[PDB]
Design a binder for this molecule. Structure first.
Ligand SMILES: NS(=O)(=O)NCCNc1nonc1/C(=N/O)Nc1ccc(F)c(Br)c1
Ligand SMILES: [Zn+2]
Length: 257
């Protein structure tokens, strides 16, 4: 029922999900001049060498690549995090034009797209329990700008023609998510929420400072996806982003000066 259109988009979500107007909603604008460098923050540990990707799915909102999270194979540790967070899936948000598509903004700047790598805290045993905890989830957010092609994204782009419509899935084994990371792990962090229903307020956000570059041809292939199911009127999957939400009583911390 929820989506990104005039009649079902972000301004409507609070009716089914009242936490949409909560105290720790995401995304937010990252004001680089009010974010506090926190020298007590540790380096982030991204340990993706043993990652086991499974499937790629058009879920009617985005496309997602799912991972085996039955063991510590692809984990995030350190930075602002206590303990070990397992990678469950990644997905993207993107625009109809190159000047919009990101959910987070940086000094009000919107990027062409944003990659979200979703992780859950292993002390809660499964993602369904983790979703109910204020420290249950950690999302690593990476901005996309249009420039040079990202070679590590091409295997994703090339399969999207096989998952054009809602509910379509395909095998997507042996994908290495290390190929989606920028050089630097410098980040901003703040407590927030999922940016899609159910908008659960259990996410530690880690947003990397350095965007990755993707080619115009790569992002054009995202924009050929459909929100609709096979047989329904064709509605291009574009502008599947939630805008910035009130910061309220929150501090954004930076890992870098
Ligand atoms: N745009 S965002 O903030 O990164 N949204 C991510 C939303 N997806 C998920 N968050 O955390 N588990 C997620 C996910 N991926 O397949 N499955 C999932 C599993 C169980 C549940 F009860 C719910 Br609700 C979602
Ligand atoms: Zn997301």
């Amino acid at each position: 029922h929820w989506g990104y259109g005039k009649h079902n988009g972000p301004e409507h979500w609070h009716k089914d999900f009242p936490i949409a107007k909560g105290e720790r909603q995401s995304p937010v604008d990252i004001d680089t001049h009010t974010a506090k460098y926190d020298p007590s923050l540790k380096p982030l540990s991204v340990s993706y060498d043993q990652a086991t990707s499974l499937r790629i799915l058009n879920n009617g909102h985005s496309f997602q690549v799912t991972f085996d999270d039955s063991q510590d194979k692809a984990v995030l540790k350190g930075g602002p995090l206590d303990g070990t967070y397992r990678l469950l899936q990644f997905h993207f948000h993107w625009g109809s034009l190159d000047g919009q598509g990101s959910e987070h903004t940086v000094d009000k700047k919107k990027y062409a797209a944003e990659l979200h790598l979703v992780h859950w805290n292993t002390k809660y045993g499964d993602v369904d329990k983790a979703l109910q905890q204020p420290d249950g989830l950690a999302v690593l957010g990476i901005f996309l700008k249009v420039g040079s092609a990202k070679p590590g994204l091409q295997k994703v782009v090339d399969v999207l023609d096989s998952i054009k419509t809602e509910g379509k899935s395909a095998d997507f084994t042996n994908f290495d998510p290390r190929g989606l990371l920028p050089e630097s792990l410098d980040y901003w962090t703040y407590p927030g929420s999922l940016t899609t229903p159910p908008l659960a307020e259990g996410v530690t956000w880690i947003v990397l400072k350095e965007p990755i570059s993707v080619s115009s041809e790569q992002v054009l292939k995202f924009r050929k996806l459909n929100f609709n199911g096979e047989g329904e009127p064709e509605e291009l999957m574009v502008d599947n982003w939630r805008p910035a939400q009130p910061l309220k009583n929150r501090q954004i911390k930076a890992s870098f000066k």
